[PDB]
Amino acid sequence: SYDIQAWKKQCEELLNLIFQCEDSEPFRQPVDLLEYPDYRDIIDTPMDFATVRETLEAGNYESPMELCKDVRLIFSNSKAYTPSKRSRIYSMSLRLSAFFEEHISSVLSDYKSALRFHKRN
Numbered sequence: 001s002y003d004i005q006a007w008k009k010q011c012e013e014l015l016n017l018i019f020q021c022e023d024s025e026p027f028r029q030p031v032d033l034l035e036y037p038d039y040r041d042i043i044d045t046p047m048d049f050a051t052v053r054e055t056l057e058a059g060n061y062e063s064p065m066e067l068c069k070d071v072r073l074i075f076s077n078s079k080a081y082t083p084s085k086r087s088r089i090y091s092m093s094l095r096l097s098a099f100f101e102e103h104i105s106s107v108l109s110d111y112k113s114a115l116r117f118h119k120r121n
């Protein structure tokens with residue numbers, strides 16, 4: 001399965017599934033500072049799923065590794081902003097992360113295999 005471009009539609013598909021998940025609701029749009037005015041004192045680089053989807057559709061990811069780095073930043077930002085492990089929004093981030101990781105693993109493997117096949121000779 002050596003299609004070097006297949007990861008893009010696979011990532012679009014996976015973002016559609018993440019948008020259907022009720023657990024994505026807090027992460028679907030950039031954090032609002034009016035409710036969280038301290039947010040940028042804690043978080044250096046905000047990230048959200050709408051920004052990831054727009055970056056993909058603009059043609060501004062070169063690989064699924066780059067997309068994966070931004071999605072992982074959504075989750076590390078939640079983990080750094082939470083005052084406790086027993087946070088509703090943090091617990092939503094941890095279920096959504098498990099779902100994402102379960103689905104992205106084949107996307108990454110197939111892409112990396114395709115690149116290795118391209119440079120086989």
Ligand SMILES: CCCCNC(=O)N1CCN(C(=O)c2cccs2)CC1
Binds near residue numbers: 027
């Ligand atoms: C505009 C619609 C929602 C935008 N998101 C939003 O406001 N937040 C989700 C991300 N976040 C957190 O990860 C945590 C809050 C408490 C524990 S972690 C801060 C709040």
